Design a protein around this nucleic acid. Structure first.
Lengths: 123, 96, 83, 79, 128, 101, 29, 123, 123
RNA sequence: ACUGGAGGAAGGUGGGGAUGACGUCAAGUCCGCAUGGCCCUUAUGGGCUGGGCCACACACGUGCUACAAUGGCAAUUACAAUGGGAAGCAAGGCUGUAAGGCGGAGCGAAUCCGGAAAGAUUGCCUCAGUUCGGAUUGUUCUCUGCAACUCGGGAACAUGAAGUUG
RNA sequence: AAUUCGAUACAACGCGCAAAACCUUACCAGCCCUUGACAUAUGAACAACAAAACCUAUCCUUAACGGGAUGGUACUCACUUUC
C-alpha cells in the first residue's frame, strides 16, 4: 500500500529479492511455527495459486519508470532513418513532452510513438 | 431518443485521440514542411462525424435533449421533480 | 491586390487558411464546400457552387481570394414587401 | 563581487519542463490535457433491468400483451 | 436465497463487497409507499370500489396513525369523459405544520381508459 | 497544543458531526463548512414560465482532527486497522514522514 | 464602446486594458 | 539530514476506482541543515525559485507527473539529488571567477613583471 | 482595552489603552488609509464628548466590505471598547446612540425579480 | 387589545426567506415523461450532407447604450463578497501595439487562482453634436472546431447614423 | 427550400432556450435504408466443434453515410449471422 514509513525511497529501480528468502523470516518469526521445511515448501506450492488469484482480483501489473526508457526508444525508432532532419527533432520533443502529463494512459503514451512510426513508414 | 448520440459518442471513442490527436500533431509545429497534408488534408478528413462539438450530451433519465445539467445527467425537469421525491443526497431547500 | 494579400498571409500569419477537404478532387463541380476559404492557386475557375438544391454558379476571380468558396451564393433572399 | 554574477548558470532546471527559447506555438498544449476519449463517452449509465430475467421477459411480455389486445381488433401495424 | 442471488448480481456488476438484509416490518403498511403500492394493486384487475378501499383502510390501519388524507384522480367511474378528483380525510391532516412525519408517494395504474392515479398523505403520531 | 509529524484527519460528508464516530484523536473537530447553490425553477412543463424558481442547495461538511505522531511503528499499527475502517462517508488521512538521509 | 470603460464592460482586452502592462510599467520603473 | 514529507490517504468512497488526489507527494528539506557553502546554496536557491520557502529554509519538490505514490516517493529524491549536484558545481565556478579576476589584474598592477619575465628566464 | 465592530460585511478590531495620540489601523497611518475626503470627522465624533481627545490610544485593524462598511466597523469597535470605565460610560453613550450596530445588512436577491423589490413590467 | 416607558444588541410578526386552503379558469403541455383513442408501417419511420430556424415594406415587448460637465479622458491611489478550478484555475519570466504566444512556482483547492468598479488625487477639457455619442462602417489579424461566404467570439487602427430628457 | 414547433389580458411575447456552424431539430432539398439504429420469438437457415462473420489498424473510392477491400486480432454448439 503506502510505505514502511521508516525508510526513504530506497528504490533506485533495484531488483526483486526472490522467494525462499523466508530463511530470514524463519530466524525472525518461525518461533511460532513447526520443525518442517517442506511446510514452507507446500506454502509455496499453494502460493502459486494464491498469486494466480492475487493478480486476478488485484490488477494487471504496472511496470516501472523504464516506461520512460521504452518510450524514448519508441521515439528513436519512430524516425528510424535520417529522413526529414526535422522529424527527429519533432520526435524528441514529443517524447520529452508526452511523458509529462500525469494521467495520459501509459499505454497510449506508447501507442502515440507507435503511430508516429506508422505514418513515418507510410512517409 | 439517445440512440444516435450513443453511436456518435462511441464513434468518438473509436476515432479517439489515438488517431485525432495524432493527425493534429503536424498541424501546429512548423519545420515539417514536407507535405503537412499527410497529417492535415488526406488523413485528418475523419468522416464528417466522430467529432467532439457534435456530441450534444443529452439527459439519460428521460432524454431531454437540452437544458441538461452536466453533473446529475438529469434534465431540469426530473432534477427538481426528483430531489423533491427524495433519493437526492443532501439536496435541500436553500432557506438561507 | 487580393492575390498579393493571400501570399503575404500564406503561413507567416499562424492560422493558415482552411480548405474543406474536397480540395483534392477536380475543380469545376458542385461544391457544397460551404465555409471552405477561396483557393488563391485556382482563380479563373468555372465551378458551380453548393447545391442542397438551387446551386448558385460563381466565376472564380482574383477579386474573390479571401472570402469563402460560395461568395456568390446568397441565402436569406428576402428584400421586398409592398404591404 | 563577480560571485553574485557568476553564481547563476541556471538553465537546465532538471524538474522536467519542455522549453522553447523563442516561443513558436508548440505541440505542448495539445498534449497537456487529460484525455477526452473515454470519460465523456461513458456518460449513459446503466439500469440493472437489463439483468434480472424476472423483469426481463416481463416488460416485453406486457408489450406483447398490448400486441395481443390490439391484434384482437386488428388495428395493429401490418406490413 | 434470492438474497444470495442479488448479492451475486450487483456485487458482480459493481465490483464491491455487499450485504443485503430483509427485516419483517410487522405492522403492515404503516408507511406511505406501501399503502400506495397496495391500493394500486386492487385498482388493477379486477375493478374495485373506492369507498370499499377506504372502508378497509379505516377498518385495519388506524392503529395510532395520527391521520390519513387520501386523494385519487383519473377518468373516474364511469362516464369515461371529464376525468375528475375525489379525496377523503381524517382527524389530523396537516402539512403547513413542521415536525410531522407525513410521508407521501403517489402512483399511477390504469384501466385502458387512460390512467388513474392515487396519492396518499399519511401522518404519523409523533412523540409516542 | 501544536503537532509536527502526524496523521491528519479531514472528513467530508453531508452529516459528519454526531455518529458515534471515530472521535479518539488528540485534537477534536475543527471545521470549514462550505455552501453551494443551484436554483432552477418550479415547473415541470416544457412550455411556460421562466418567472418562478425553486432553490436547492448543497452544503458539504468537513471536519478536521489530527492524529498524534504515531511513530515509525505506531503509524502502521493503526494504518492497517484503518485500511478498512467504516463510518458511512469519505475522509482523508494524511501522512507526515521524516526519513534520515 | 472602445474606452477602457467600454473594454472592461464588454469583457475583452483592449489597448487601454491588459493586466500585464500593470506590471511591465513598474518593472520598467 | 532530516526530512519532512506528506502523502495523502483519502478513501475511495465505495466507487471501485482511484481517487485523484492520491498521487500527491510533498517534500521539505533545509539547505541550512544540508551544510553548504553560501554560493552553491544560492545557486540552488536560484535554480528552484519560488519552490523554496525562504522565510524559513525549505526546499519543496513535488512532481505530480507520476501516478502511484511509490513512483512519486521516488521522483522526489531523484530530483533532490539532481539539484544537489547541479548546484554543487557552483563553488568551482566561483573559484574560477576568483582566478580570472586576480589574473587580469596581476598584469596591470605593476612590479609583477619580475615573475612575468622570470617565467621566461626559466624558459 | 479591546473592542470590535462590524457593519455591512466589514469587521474591525480596536484596542484602547489610556494613552497619548496614537491611532493606527492596519498599523498604518489611519488618516491615509481612510482618505482625507471624509470618514475622519465621522470616526472622531465618538470622542468629541466627555473627552478632550487627550486621554487614550487606539491600535486598530479592519477588513472586508467597503469604504462606509469599514468606517462603521471601526466606529462600533471603539464603541465596544469604550468599556474601560464599564458601568459609567454607556450612560453618556446610549443617549446619542453610540452603542448599536446598523442592522440594515444587505437584503438578498429573490428569484423572478431583478432585485429585492424591483420587478419587471407586465402589460 | 391599543398607547407609550423600561431594560436591552435586538419591542412587540426585530429583517429575510421558506412555507401557498377550498377551489376556479375544459388555463398550459399528449413537443419532457407517462398515457387512452385515431392514422403511416419501403412510410409521417432511421440515419448523411447541404440548406433552414438569423430575412424583410412593416407594429408591438422586454434589455442595453446615452444626449453630458453631479460630467468624457489620462495618469496616480482605497475598500468587497460570494464564489470557480483537472476537456481545469494558473503566479513569475520571456514575446507580441495589443487580442493573442511561449512555458510554468502551486492548486482536485480555509492553504495554489482572481489588478474590483464606483469612489478618491491632479491634470486636460469649458459646453460643443463636442475628447459627450457610438450603430453602420476598411484593412490586417487571431480563439475553437475537422470545419467561421448564408451560419461563432476577439484585438489593432479610420470612418462616426441618430441622440441636447424622448 | 425552411424562415420548425408550443405558448396569447392581468396569468404569453429576453417565453421551452441553463446557451441554432454541422450536431441541437421536429422544419426544407438532395443521399440513401426499409424485421430498419433499436426489441423480443421466429425457425426455413447455415454449419463451426471453430468457420464465417465480428473487431483493434493499412490501403482506395462516396459532398458525406458508407462502401470496397486488407491484414491482423478475435469466437461461439451458438451462432446477432443471414435474409
Amino acid at each position: 500500500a503506502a510505505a514502511a514509513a521508516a525508510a526513504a525511497a530506497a528504490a533506485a529501480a533495484a531488483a526483486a529479492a526472490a522467494a525462499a528468502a523466508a530463511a530470514a523470516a524463519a530466524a525472525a518469526a518461525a518461533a511460532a511455527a513447526a520443525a518442517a521445511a517442506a511446510a514452507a515448501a507446500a506454502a509455496a506450492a499453494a502460493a502459486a495459486a494464491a498469486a494466480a488469484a492475487a493478480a486476478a482480483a488485484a490488477a494487471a501489473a504496472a511496470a516501472a519508470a523504464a516506461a520512460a526508457a521504452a518510450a524514448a526508444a519508441a521515439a528513436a525508432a519512430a524516425a528510424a532513418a535520417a529522413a526529414a532532419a526535422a522529424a527527429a527533432a519533432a520526435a524528441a520533443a514529443a517524447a520529452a513532452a508526452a511523458a509529462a502529463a500525469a494521467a495520459a494512459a501509459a499505454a497510449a503514451a506508447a501507442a502515440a510513438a507507435a503511430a508516429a512510426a506508422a505514418a513515418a513508414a507510410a512517409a | 431518443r439517445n440512440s444516435a448520440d450513443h453511436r456518435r459518442r462511441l464513434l468518438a471513442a473509436r476515432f479517439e485521440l489515438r488517431r485525432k490527436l495524432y493527425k493534429a500533431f503536424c498541424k501546429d509545429p512548423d519545420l515539417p514542411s514536407e507535405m503537412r497534408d499527410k497529417n492535415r488534408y488526406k488523413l485528418s478528413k475523419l468522416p464528417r462525424n466522430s467529432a467532439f462539438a457534435r456530441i450534444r450530451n443529452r439527459c439519460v433519465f428521460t432524454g431531454r435533449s437540452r437544458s441538461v445539467t452536466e453533473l446529475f445527467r438529469v434534465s431540469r425537469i426530473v432534477f427538481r421533480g426528483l430531489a423533491s421525491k427524495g433519493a437526492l443526497m443532501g439536496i435541500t431547500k436553500s432557506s438561507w | 491586390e487580393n492575390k498579393m494579400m493571400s501570399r503575404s498571409v500564406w503561413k507567416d500569419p499562424f492560422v493558415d487558411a482552411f480548405l474543406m477537404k474536397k480540395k483534392n478532387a477536380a475543380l469545376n463541380r458542385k461544391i457544397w464546400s460551404r465555409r471552405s476559404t477561396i483557393l488563391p492557386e485556382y482563380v479563373d475557375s468555372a465551378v458551380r457552387i453548393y447545391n442542397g438544391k438551387t446551386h448558385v454558379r460563381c466565376k472564380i476571380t482574383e477579386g474573390k481570394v479571401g472570402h469563402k468558396f460560395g461568395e456568390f451564393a446568397f441565402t436569406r433572399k428576402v428584400k421586398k414587401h409592398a404591404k | 563581487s563577480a560571485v553574485g554574477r557568476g553564481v547563476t548558470e541556471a538553465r537546465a532546471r532538471i524538474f522536467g519542463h519542455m522549453l522553447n527559447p523563442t516561443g513558436q506555438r508548440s505541440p505542448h498544449k495539445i498534449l497537456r490535457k487529460k484525455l477526452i476519449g473515454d470519460k465523456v463517452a461513458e456518460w449513459y449509465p446503466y439500469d440493472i433491468k437489463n439483468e434480472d430475467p424476472n423483469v426481463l421477459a416481463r416488460e416485453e411480455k406486457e408489450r406483447i400483451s398490448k400486441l395481443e389486445m390490439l391484434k384482437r381488433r386488428d388495428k395493429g401495424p401490418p406490413k | 436465497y434470492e438474497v444470495k442471488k442479488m448479492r451475486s448480481f450487483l456485487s458482480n456488476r459493481t465490483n464491491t463487497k455487499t450485504l443485503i438484509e430483509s427485516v419483517k416490518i410487522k405492522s403492515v403498511y404503516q408507511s406511505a409507499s406501501l399503502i400506495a403500492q397496495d391500493i394500486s394493486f386492487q385498482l388493477k384487475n379486477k375493478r374495485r370500489s373506492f369507498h370499499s378501499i377506504f372502508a378497509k383502510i379505516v377498518k385495519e390501519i388506524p392503529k395510532g396513525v395520527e391521520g390519513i388524507r387520501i386523494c385519487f384522480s383519473g377518468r373516474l367511474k364511469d362516464a369515461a369523459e371529464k376525468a375528475q378528483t375525489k379525496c377523503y380525510k381524517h382527524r389530523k391532516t396537516s402539512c403547513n405544520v413542521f415536525n410531522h412525519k407525513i410521508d407521501y408517494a403517489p402512483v399511477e395504474v390504469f384501466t385502458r381508459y387512460g390512467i388513474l392515479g392515487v396519492k396518499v398523505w399519511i401522518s404519523y403520531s409523533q412523540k409516542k | 497544543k501544536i503537532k509536527g509529524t502526524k496523521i491528519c484527519i479531514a472528513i467530508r460528508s453531508f452529516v459528519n458531526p454526531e455518529k458515534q464516530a471515530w472521535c479518539l484523536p488528540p485534537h477534536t473537530r475543527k471545521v470549514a463548512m462550505p455552501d453551494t447553490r443551484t436554483l432552477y425553477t418550479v415547473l415541470r412543463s416544457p412550455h411556460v414560465d421562466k418567472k418562478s424558481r425553486e432553490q436547492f442547495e448543497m452544503r458539504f461538511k468537513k471536519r478536521f482532527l489530527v492524529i498524534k505522531a504515531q511513530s515509525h511503528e505506531l503509524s502502521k499499527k493503526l494504518f492497517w486497522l484503518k485500511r478498512y475502517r467504516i463510518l458511512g462517508a469519505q475522509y482523508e488521512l494524511q501522512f507526515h514522514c521524516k526519513t534520515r538521509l | 464602446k472602445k474606452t477602457k470603460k467600454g473594454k472592461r464592460f464588454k469583457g475583452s482586452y483592449g489597448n487601454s486594458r491588459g493586466k500585464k502592462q500593470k506590471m511591465i510599467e513598474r518593472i520598467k520603473d | 539530514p532530516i526530512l519532512r514529507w506528506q502523502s495523502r490517504i483519502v478513501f475511495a468512497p465505495g466507487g471501485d476506482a482511484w481517487h485523484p488526489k492520491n498521487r500527491k507527494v510533498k517534500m521539505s528539506v533545509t539547505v541550512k541543515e544540508l551544510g553548504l557553502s553560501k554560493h552553491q546554496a544560492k545557486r540552488l536557491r536560484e535554480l528552484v525559485g519560488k519552490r523554496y520557502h525562504s522565510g524559513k529554509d525549505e526546499l519543496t519538490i513535488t512532481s505530480e507527473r507520476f501516478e502511484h505514490r511509490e513512483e512519486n516517493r521516488k521522483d522526489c529524491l531523484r530530483t533532490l539529488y539532481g539539484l544537489i549536484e547541479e548546484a554543487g558545481k557552483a563553488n568551482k565556478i566561483a573559484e574560477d571567477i576568483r582566478t580570472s579576476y586576480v589574473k587580469q589584474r596581476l598584469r596591470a598592477n605593476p612590479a609583477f613583471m619580475q615573475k612575468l619575465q622570470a617565467k621566461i628566464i626559466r624558459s | 482595552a479591546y473592542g470590535t465592530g462590524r457593519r455591512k460585511c466589514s469587521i474591525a478590531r480596536v484596542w484602547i489603552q489610556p494613552g497619548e495620540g496614537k491611532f493606527q489601523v492596519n498599523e498604518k497611518e489611519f488618516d491615509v488609509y481612510f482618505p482625507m475626503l471624509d470618514h475622519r470627522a465621522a470616526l472622531l465624533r465618538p470622542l468629541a464628548e466627555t473627552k478632550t481627545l487627550g486621554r487614550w490610544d487606539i491600535k486598530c485593524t479592519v477588513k472586508g466590505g467597503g469604504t462606509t462598511g469599514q468606517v462603521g466597523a471601526i466606529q462600533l469597535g471603539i464603541s465596544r471598547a469604550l468599556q474601560n470605565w464599564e458601568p459609567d460610560m454607556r450612560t453618556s453613550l446610549r443617549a446619542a446612540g453610540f452603542l448599536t450596530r446598523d442592522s440594515r445588512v444587505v437584503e438578498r436577491k429573490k428569484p423572478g425579480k431583478a432585485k429585492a423589490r424591483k420587478s419587471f413590467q407586465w402589460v
